[PDB]
Write a protein that binds this ligand. Structure first.
Ligand SMILES: [Ca+2]
Ligand SMILES: [Ca+2]
Ligand SMILES: [Ca+2]
Ligand SMILES: [Ca+2]
Ligand SMILES: [Ca+2]
Ligand SMILES: [Ca+2]
Ligand SMILES: [Ca+2]
Ligand SMILES: [Ca+2]
Lengths: 214, 200
């Protein structure tokens, strides 16, 4: 019994040490004769060369240096088996390296101050504005690139505190109170925050200023 | 050509969605046994009995279980299935104390070890830098006879005095705000205080 295909999933920024053993190739001509293993492809013998190698006789696939997913997220190499008489009896084997994400990028708001406006009598639940923070990490297979939004605080507290909320995923800020009145309060300042790993990672801070309209 | 053995490396806290395909077994019907499948913790992994696709049924936690050894079956002797759970940086570093203390005589020479501070991080420090702490000094008070009178070693957390001008009568005590940062200096940072007594 065997795997139909076995990609190797390798976290970026490994400590190693290097060179680091990945998995071991085995030719089909096992007992018979002496086999020599080689590999080819982008990452081995074309750009970028020598990121991967193979032990000619064993043939342990080796990683020679830490990877960076945001540079190259996937490698596709080929493994070759050749006897000491130069003959092969098997096709190249597809070797697939999937570089898995680490949380090596901090979230960044696209602006340090966001601006919105809202009419003094709208229905509670009404969208006021939407803020955005980006993260270069992967947000498809990991949370490392996924930002969770929050509001740290709000000024002034008039009529009262907690007049707005922000959607945790979308960053749409909403008003959740009646009693907006420019006359008493023309503008609100909210500290907003975004935290990667969907709330568990690191945080960054910006300001949202909400103008009350007539 | 083929792999002699192929473990499956699966990062903890995956988004999935679940159940999530891993690799597909090939030899008629497939099953799996072992801790993770049929014994505790039960139901974490499973297989589609006709396709042979190994499935993970929920996100994993390296800090709970860092690996699994399962056995794949067809109805050939059984195949070892190894799952390696790889680390994500889901813990922040934390000094072991809020305040650390050490002392030196005023005549000690530059390079003298004052104290060793420590911060812990529950993440892996073997394969990744997620649990690897890099120490630094944030700031020193007072700055008499000068600033930057002390260093801290980036990995050991040993605080050393490098100034030649210690004088208890003028300044009997230095307060250092110190830092520990995971991912060996590129991650999150936590803070504590180190108080250096100049001994009478
Ligand atoms: Ca990277
Ligand atoms: Ca990130
Ligand atoms: Ca990354
Ligand atoms: Ca965990
Ligand atoms: Ca544990
Ligand atoms: Ca950590
Ligand atoms: Ca972890
Ligand atoms: Ca004295």
């Amino acid at each position: 019994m065997d795997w139909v295909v076995a990609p190797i999933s390798v976290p970026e920024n490994g400590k190693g040490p290097f060179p680091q053993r990945l998995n071991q190739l085995k030719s089909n001509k096992d007992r018979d004769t002496k086999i020599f293993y080689s590999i080819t492809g982008p990452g081995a013998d074309s750009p970028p060369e020598g990121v991967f190698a193979v032990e000619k006789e064993t043939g342990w696939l080796l990683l020679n240096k830490p990877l960076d997913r945001e540079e190259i997220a996937k490698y596709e190499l080929f493994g070759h088996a050749v006897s000491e008489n130069g003959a092969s009896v098997e096709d190249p084997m597809n070797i697939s390296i999937i570089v898995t994400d680490q949380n090596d990028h901090k979230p960044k708001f696209t602006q340090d101050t966001f601006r919105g406006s809202v009419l003094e009598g709208v229905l509670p639940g009404t969208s006021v504005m939407q803020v955005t923070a980006t993260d270069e990490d992967d947000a498809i297979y990991t949370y490392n690139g996924v930002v969770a939004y929050s509001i740290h605080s709000q000024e002034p507290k008039d009529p009262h505190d907690l007049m707005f909320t922000i959607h945790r995923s979308t960053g749409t800020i909403s008003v959740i109170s009646s009693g907006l009145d420019r006359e008493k309060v023309p503008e609100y300042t909210l500290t907003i925050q975004a935290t990667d790993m969907d709330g568990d990672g690191s945080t960054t801070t910006a300001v949202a200023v909400v103008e009350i309209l007539d």
